Design a protein around this ligand. Structure first.
Ligand SMILES: CCCCNC(=O)[C@@H](C[C@H](O)[C@H](CC1CCCCC1)NC(=O)[C@H](Cc1cnc[nH]1)NC(=O)[C@H](Cc1ccccc1)CS(=O)(=O)C(C)(C)C)C(C)C
Ligand SMILES: CCCCNC(=O)[C@@H](C[C@H](O)[C@H](CC1CCCCC1)NC(=O)[C@H](Cc1cnc[nH]1)NC(=O)[C@H](Cc1ccccc1)CS(=O)(=O)C(C)(C)C)C(C)C
Ligand SMILES: *[C@@H]1O[C@H](CO)[C@@H](O)[C@H](O)[C@H]1NC(C)=O
Ligand SMILES: *[C@@H]1O[C@H](CO)[C@@H](O)[C@H](O)[C@H]1NC(C)=O
Lengths: 329, 329
């Protein structure tokens, strides 16, 4: 049946984006594919320059598409970081060589913080309809509906060809060994149960289990405030407003951290979670983990983002309601 | 004797910048005048595009100035938000019509977060030599040395002509009534003692006194984490990663807050500290106060930034080692 690959661009290990086409003739946008949300949005032409982010990103022109079909229902999307607003609209979107008719948001309010840090123009949510603001049907469900993929699976490869997403399968040239599957805990959200976070060889957190959201659109690993505090305490890291830091010379003295998912320990070492700019002292190096209080019902949960995904080739399987991981290569 | 005015630009109540000229012929830069630090820096030509902030800001070309005199000593400047590095250099800088020969840093490392949010290109520190990285003499001391101002005072006017700094005096067309002075607590830093932070009519914080740094280069009012927690609890605000928020419809139900400085209560009302984008519910409005742990020896202290200054015309008096405040207009 069908399998499409979507080539991603790695921007500093913190932004992995690819391209989609909207409208007829197609208008191209760079978007992050986020498993933590389910709406599609891009910036709109109706966005005021009285919003800088809109001056520095690609804007979608409805009047230039033949397939545009107006909706206009208002839309507000509150993310962990960043809130965007605009109105709903409909047109054809093609990603990976597959064209679907999709309801997407045209954004007219895009805050500078965090959008001016953005190298992408928008977001394509790869979550479930239960997370979809406006009960709008997610792009992948529509894709599935079209009945064309070999399987109802999608895979993420984040590199250290900055990346690659495979719709309807996996690419083995990017993972070593077999996959290890963990079942969805609840349906409607990509979350699984975690059985412990260990430092070195000791279980410090989440000992009586906890939840992990597997989120491709989160650049770092997240944990609740209370947990990250305890963790950083253990690693010997300092809190900055924007990140946890460590003297760069100490980067390689930092213990390994491991996530107990399902039947395995998934370990990240100092090399996987420190942005080792220098081995120089008196120069603070960033850790790729930070705190994030995700409100219920979905939170509190950890969030295994790009720091994790970079090491573990991730498979999102919609037929079986489960997630598989294999070592990336 | 002499008085110069420096016209500032208000960018969203969060960035107040003006212009200086460097080199011969002069190279123009927009800089924030920060009373919280003492070095001068601008971006350098030797900055890599492999740093986006440098692609979007004005860069200083040493080779194009006749007056440039090479130094090259390395320099790292760690701010509350943002760390910049580069090397030291010397050339003439003119601000406000006064030319001095100054040692400034040429920045070659400028992180995206927070610099891509920057509408200015650099910083001009208006602090004391005790805060000067590299023991480099501050621009104002050099100005003073030139022996030309009417007085050793500088005044800040932040508007809601987005602003105006007066070197060597004050501009009365921007303040109502007389000034109220508070003595420096310690010399070498613009910090005074505070006698209480009240909510409504009750003293909630800093009851046995505390320290306040008067910082023009801080967009919001700052307090230590423990204090802001208690304060926000009292105002009924929610914590976002980047700011404290409140439902916009509640903006005007928020109590007044008052700072007991010296012999007066300085009160900010909901109107002064909420970024009232809408009176619409289900739409989070930003408070202009946040938490900031300033390490000792200077910290812990509060930081009365632009939110404060906008309401209270501030005078920094170097002859007498004190700070005066008057109502802005
Ligand atoms: C509208 C319903 C959305 C529901 N879901 C969410 O908000 C999920 C978060 C979500 O996956 C979003 C998806 C991204 C897509 C890119 C644009 C912003 C949002 N991620 C974030 O909010 C995460 C935070 C997080 C980590 N762990 C949990 N949450 N944000 C980030 O990683 C930020 C992503 C980003 C990167 C560059 C430019 C703009 C934005 C990076 S960042 O945290 O601001 C920083 C720069 C590392 C400090 C939560 C619930 C799990
Ligand atoms: C090298 C020695 C410096 C020593 N001094 C300081 O760092 C002082 C902070 C200092 O006044 C600096 C001066 C500014 C000048 C503009 C560029 C960055 C720094 N201010 C900050 O770090 C303050 C934080 C603070 C508040 N209260 C205490 N500290 N930062 C800000 O206000 C940020 C200023 C900014 C604005 C736009 C673009 C870039 C940067 C705003 S922000 O906090 O990031 C935010 C966007 C409101 C979240 C501390 C010690 C009082
Ligand atoms: C927009 O589509 C939504 C689907 O939820 C529908 O309720 C609404 O009526 C549509 N608006 C228009 C103008 O068709
Ligand atoms: C730079 O000026 C500093 C002043 O602290 C001095 O110690 C250093 O020697 C100067 N560098 C050169 C090359 O003159």
């Amino acid at each position: 049946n069908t399998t499409s690959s979507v080539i991603l661009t790695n921007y500093m290990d913190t932004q992995y984006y690819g391209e989609i086409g909207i409208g007829t003739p197609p208008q191209t946008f760079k978007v992050v594919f986020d498993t933590g949300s389910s709406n599609v949005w891009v910036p709109s032409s109706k966005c005021s320059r009285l919003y800088t982010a809109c001056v520095y990103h690609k804007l979608f022109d409805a009047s230039d598409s033949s397939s545009y079909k107006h909706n206009g229902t208002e839309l507000t999307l509150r993310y962990s970081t960043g809130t965007v607003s605009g109105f709903l609209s409909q047109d054809i979107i093609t990603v990976g060589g597959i064209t679907v008719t999709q309801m997407f948001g045209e954004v007219t309010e895009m805050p500078a913080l965090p959008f001016m840090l953005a190298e992408f123009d928008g977001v394509v949510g790869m979550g479930f309809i239960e997370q979809a603001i406006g009960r709008v049907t997610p792009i992948f469900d529509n894709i599935i509906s079209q009945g064309v993929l070999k399987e109802d699976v999608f895979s993420f490869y984040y590199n250290r060809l900055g990346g690659q997403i495979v719709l309807g399968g996996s690419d083995p040239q990017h993972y070593e060994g077999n996959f290890h599957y963990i079942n969805l805990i609840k349906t409607g959200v990509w979350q699984i149960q975690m059985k412990g976070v260990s430092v070195g060889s000791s279980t410090l957190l989440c000992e009586d289990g906890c939840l992990a959201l597997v989120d491709t659109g989160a650049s770092y690993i997240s944990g609740s405030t209370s947990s990250i505090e305890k963790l950083m305490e253990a690693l010997g890291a300092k809190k900055r407003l924007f990140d946890y830091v460590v003297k760069c010379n100490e980067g390689p003295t930092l213990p390994d951290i491991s996530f107990h998912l399902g039947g395995k320990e998934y370990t990240l070492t100092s090399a996987d979670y420190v942005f080792q700019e220098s081995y120089s002292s008196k120069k603070l190096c960033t850790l790729a983990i930070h705190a994030m209080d995700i409100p219920p019902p979905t939170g509190p949960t950890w969030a295994l983002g790009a720091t994790f995904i970079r090491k573990f080739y991730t498979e999102f399987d919609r037929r079986n309601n489960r997630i598989g991981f294999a070592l990336a290569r």
